[PDB]
Amino acid sequence: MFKAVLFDLDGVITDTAEYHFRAWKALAEEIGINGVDRQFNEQLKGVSREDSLQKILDLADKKVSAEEFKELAKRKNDNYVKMIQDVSPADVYPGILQLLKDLRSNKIKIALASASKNGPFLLERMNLTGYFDAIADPAEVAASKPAPDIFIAAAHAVGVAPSESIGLEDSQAGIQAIKDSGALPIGVGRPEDLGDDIVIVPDTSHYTLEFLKEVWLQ
Ligand SMILES: O=P(O)(O)OC[C@H]1O[C@@H](O)[C@H](O)[C@@H](O)[C@@H]1O
Ligand SMILES: [Mg+2]
Numbered sequence: 280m281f282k283a284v285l286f287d288l289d290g291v292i293t294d295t296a297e298y299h300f301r302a303w304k305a306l307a308e309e310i311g312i313n314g315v316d317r318q319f320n321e322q323l324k325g326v327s328r329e330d331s332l333q334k335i336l337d338l339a340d341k342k343v344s345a346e347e348f349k350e351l352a353k354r355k356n357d358n359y360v361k362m363i364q365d366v367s368p369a370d371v372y373p374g375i376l377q378l379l380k381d382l383r384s385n386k387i388k389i390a391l392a393s394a395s396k397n398g399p400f401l402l403e404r405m406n407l408t409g410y411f412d413a414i415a416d417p418a419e420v421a422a423s424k425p426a427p428d429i430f431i432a433a434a435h436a437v438g439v440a441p442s443e444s445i446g447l448e449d450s451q452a453g454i455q456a457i458k459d460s461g462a463l464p465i466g467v468g469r470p471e472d473l474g475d476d477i478v479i480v481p482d483t484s485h486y487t488l489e490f491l492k493e494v495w496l497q
């Protein structure tokens with residue numbers, strides 16, 4: 280049986296992928312770049328703050344000073360952090376709270392593998408911190424998603440091998456990171472976005488302990 284579940288946060292635990300998108304799109308437009316639509320945003324999900332800005336600049340076409348790059352990343356984060364202040368337990372996605380409870384009752388370890396430096400704040404807003412056995416700090420890894428480092432770190436922080444773990448993700452970059460760690464991915468979203476070569480569910484209500492067991496046994 281699997282011994283740990285490694286959770287992405289944004290777009291898995293709650294709808295904050297939507298807020299990252301809205302904030303990046305507002306930033307891009309302030310600097311005269313309009314290519315940041317929902318289709319392009321699939322390339323930004325799971326990607327670090329600095330890598331996200333670089334992808335937006337690369338889109339069209341475009342270079343800024345080192346000083347301006349720092350200011351732009353800060354401006355987006357300040358806006359995003361204002362947006363999330365009113366997040367509460369009522370915003371936890373369907374199935375997630377019950378899954379956390381059921382995992383703890385079956386002595387399965389729970390670790391956060393989010394690229395977001397705002398992850399700990401969000402878990403506190405949602406009254407979820409006490410369900411987590413570890414949080415892998417994205418500032419401590421040498422390589423961010425799609426590199427596997429953060430998923431490997433999350434597994435190791437709870438004393439489990441990645442190959443004894445399931446990873447839950449909403450993003451192309453994060454699915455690749457789970458694959459390359461050795462853990463088993465279960466995606467949430469559209470196969471049009473995430474691929475036809477892993478198990479994918481349409482929404483988080485499908486993330487039950489029963490289903491994770493169904494998949495692991497298959
Ligand atoms: O800017 P933050 O809060 O550190 O987040 C970094 C990344 O965190 C990931 O969880 C998100 O999917 C990305 O969209 C985001 O860029
Ligand atoms: Mg995500």
Ligand SMILES: [Mg+2]
Binds near residue numbers: 408409
């Ligand atoms: Mg605690």
